[PDB]
Design an enzyme around this catalytic site. Structure first.
Site, PDB file in Angstrom:
ATOM      1  N   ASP A 138      -5.592 -12.277   0.483  1.00 45.22           N
ATOM      2  CA  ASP A 138      -4.368 -12.727  -0.177  1.00 45.22           C
ATOM      3  C   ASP A 138      -3.234 -11.714  -0.093  1.00 45.22           C
ATOM      4  OD1 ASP A 138      -2.620 -14.318  -1.554  1.00 45.22           O
ATOM      5  OD2 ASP A 138      -3.562 -14.053  -3.515  1.00 45.22           O
ATOM      6  N   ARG A 148       3.535 -10.898  -4.098  1.00 46.73           N
ATOM      7  CA  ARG A 148       3.179 -10.828  -5.514  1.00 46.73           C
ATOM      8  C   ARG A 148       2.035  -9.845  -5.772  1.00 46.73           C
ATOM      9  NH1 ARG A 148       1.838 -15.414  -3.560  1.00 46.73           N
ATOM     10  NH2 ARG A 148      -0.352 -15.755  -2.962  1.00 46.73           N
ATOM     11  N   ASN A 149       1.303  -9.479  -4.721  1.00 45.44           N
ATOM     12  CA  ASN A 149       0.139  -8.606  -4.868  1.00 45.44           C
ATOM     13  C   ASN A 149       0.409  -7.176  -4.408  1.00 45.44           C
ATOM     14  OD1 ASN A 149      -1.389 -10.735  -5.889  1.00 45.44           O
ATOM     15  ND2 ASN A 149      -2.062 -11.380  -3.846  1.00 45.44           N
ATOM     16  N   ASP A 200      -3.325  -5.824  -5.984  1.00 44.94           N
ATOM     17  CA  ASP A 200      -4.245  -6.805  -6.547  1.00 44.94           C
ATOM     18  C   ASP A 200      -5.283  -7.234  -5.521  1.00 44.94           C
ATOM     19  OD1 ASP A 200      -5.020  -9.864  -6.861  1.00 44.94           O
ATOM     20  OD2 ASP A 200      -4.518  -9.142  -8.872  1.00 44.94           O
TER      21      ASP A 200
HETATM   22  C1  LIG Z   1      -2.371  -5.051 -12.541  1.00 44.86           C
HETATM   23  C2  LIG Z   1      -0.849  -4.847 -12.483  1.00 44.86           C
HETATM   24  O1  LIG Z   1      -0.642  -3.394 -12.375  1.00 44.86           O
HETATM   25  C3  LIG Z   1       0.594  -2.738 -12.384  1.00 44.86           C
HETATM   26  C4  LIG Z   1       1.840  -3.317 -12.804  1.00 44.86           C
HETATM   27  C5  LIG Z   1       3.042  -2.555 -12.797  1.00 44.86           C
HETATM   28  C6  LIG Z   1       4.354  -3.174 -13.243  1.00 44.86           C
HETATM   29  C7  LIG Z   1       4.684  -4.598 -13.355  1.00 44.86           C
HETATM   30  N1  LIG Z   1       5.897  -4.714 -13.772  1.00 44.86           N
HETATM   31  N2  LIG Z   1       6.410  -3.544 -13.950  1.00 44.86           N
HETATM   32  C8  LIG Z   1       7.800  -3.358 -14.431  1.00 44.86           C
HETATM   33  C9  LIG Z   1       7.844  -2.359 -15.613  1.00 44.86           C
HETATM   34  C10 LIG Z   1       9.306  -2.186 -16.086  1.00 44.86           C
HETATM   35  N3  LIG Z   1      10.208  -1.767 -14.976  1.00 44.86           N
HETATM   36  C11 LIG Z   1      10.149  -2.690 -13.805  1.00 44.86           C
HETATM   37  C12 LIG Z   1       8.706  -2.877 -13.279  1.00 44.86           C
HETATM   38  C13 LIG Z   1       5.508  -2.509 -13.640  1.00 44.86           C
HETATM   39  C14 LIG Z   1       2.944  -1.196 -12.362  1.00 44.86           C
HETATM   40  N4  LIG Z   1       1.779  -0.616 -11.959  1.00 44.86           N
HETATM   41  C15 LIG Z   1       0.647  -1.366 -11.971  1.00 44.86           C
HETATM   42  N5  LIG Z   1      -0.541  -0.731 -11.553  1.00 44.86           N
HETATM   43  C16 LIG Z   1      -0.231  -5.692 -11.314  1.00 44.86           C
HETATM   44  C17 LIG Z   1       0.770  -6.706 -11.610  1.00 44.86           C
HETATM   45 CL1  LIG Z   1       1.341  -7.041 -13.218  1.00 44.86          CL
HETATM   46  C18 LIG Z   1       1.333  -7.483 -10.558  1.00 44.86           C
HETATM   47  C19 LIG Z   1       0.936  -7.292  -9.212  1.00 44.86           C
HETATM   48  C20 LIG Z   1      -0.038  -6.313  -8.878  1.00 44.86           C
HETATM   49  F1  LIG Z   1      -0.390  -6.162  -7.590  1.00 44.86           F
HETATM   50  C21 LIG Z   1      -0.630  -5.505  -9.910  1.00 44.86           C
HETATM   51 CL2  LIG Z   1      -1.818  -4.323  -9.404  1.00 44.86          CL
END
Ligand SMILES: C[C@@H](Oc1cc(-c2cnn(C3CCNCC3)c2)cnc1N)c1c(Cl)ccc(F)c1Cl
Length: 292
Positions: A147, A151-152, A168
């Site tokens: 995938d 989005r990932n 992801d």
């Molecule tokens: C599991 C989650 O992890 C994270 C999300 C985020 C993230 C999502 N959104 N934001 C916003 C925080 C405020 N500033 C803008 C980005 C940061 C950062 N690091 C991560 N490891 C995640 C999400 Cl939510 C979406 C796609 C992905 F591939 C992953 Cl791996």
């Protein structure tokens, strides 16, 4: 406790780095199953949570996710700092990617009269190179992502020095051990959604679609088409048109990724070579992106 094998090495829940819960503080939230928070261990982290109201399979799924991401070691795959599985709700702790997911980033950072020079072609080629590098790592270690999609993917920061990483691995987790309507059909090659055949060349096709997402600045693939319409379209030889203002050399990488025969699609070494050539070509990188 389930075992996980990657690169011919087997790991167990006992191999996960358990961080004491007292050392973990949630700071702020960041739709799907479970929540994500910014946290501190100080070390800044993203925290993925497992709902306490879940089934045994949800638990096993969460565990397998932890095992998968903990065993990767590459600059373009999000790092796992550790886990907190001995307290509830259970946590997986990840590298904090301040730029957020790539799809959201592209949509929010599109050039606009207010932000006329927010992104350039080189920014996009660097993101493409970054993810292709991660994909090459997966390919060489015989791991099929299944995938690869905007989005990932995540960005380390909003600004110019950003690095894109694959974040992801839920689909690979599901397969390793849902429904038709949840399948990422718009990112899948014909032999995948028809015969359920997955190989390294599966991810090549999906990467082509990601490239289109990147150079479209975050549009949904196959505009105006439903999943079944895409299935029939692609099965019949149909392919997406170039994104607005997309340089020919870049569109050509897409169309090579979308060859019907998997054997005719490039591996990621070749994709990387072609992306690099694009980054060298002044006529490519001097091309202006559309302003909304
Ligand atoms: C599991 C989650 O992890 C994270 C999300 C985020 C993230 C999502 N959104 N934001 C916003 C925080 C405020 N500033 C803008 C980005 C940061 C950062 N690091 C991560 N490891 C995640 C999400 Cl939510 C979406 C796609 C992905 F591939 C992953 Cl791996």
């Amino acid at each position: 406790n389930p075992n996980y094998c990657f690169a011919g090495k087997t790991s167990s829940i006992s191999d996960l780095k358990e961080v004491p819960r007292k050392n973990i503080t949630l700071i702020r939230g960041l739709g799907a199953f479970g929540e994500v928070y910014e946290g501190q261990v100080p070390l800044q982290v993203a925290v993925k949570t497992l709902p306490e109201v879940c089934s045994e399979q949800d638990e096993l799924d969460f565990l397998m996710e932890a095992l998968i991401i903990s065993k990767f070691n590459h600059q373009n795959i999000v790092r796992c700092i550790g886990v907190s599985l001995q307290s509830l709700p259970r946590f997986i702790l990840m590298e904090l990617m301040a730029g957020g997911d790539l799809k959201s980033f592209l949509r929010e950072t599109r050039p606009r009269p207010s932000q006329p020079s927010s992104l350039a072609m080189l920014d996009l080629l660097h993101v493409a190179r970054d993810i292709a590098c991660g994909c090459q790592y997966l390919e060489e270690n015989h791991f099929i992502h299944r995938d690869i999609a905007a989005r990932n993917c995540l960005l380390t920061c909003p600004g110019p020095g950003r690095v894109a990483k694959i974040g992801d691995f839920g689909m690979a987790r599901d397969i390793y051990r849902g429904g038709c309507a949840m399948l990422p059909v718009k990112w899948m090659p014909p032999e995948a959604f028809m015969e359920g055949i997955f190989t390294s060349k599966t991810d090549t096709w999906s990467f082509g679609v990601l490239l289109w997402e990147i150079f479209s600045l975050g549009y949904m693939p196959y505009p105006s088409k439903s999943n079944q319409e895409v299935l029939e379209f692609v099965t019949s030889g149909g392919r997406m048109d170039p994104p607005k203002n997309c340089p020919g050399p870049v569109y050509r990488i897409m169309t090579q990724c979308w060859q019907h025969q998997p054997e005719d699609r490039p591996n990621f070494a070749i994709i990387l070579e072609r992306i690099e050539y694009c980054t060298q070509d002044p006529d490519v990188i001097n091309t202006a992106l559309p302003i909304e």
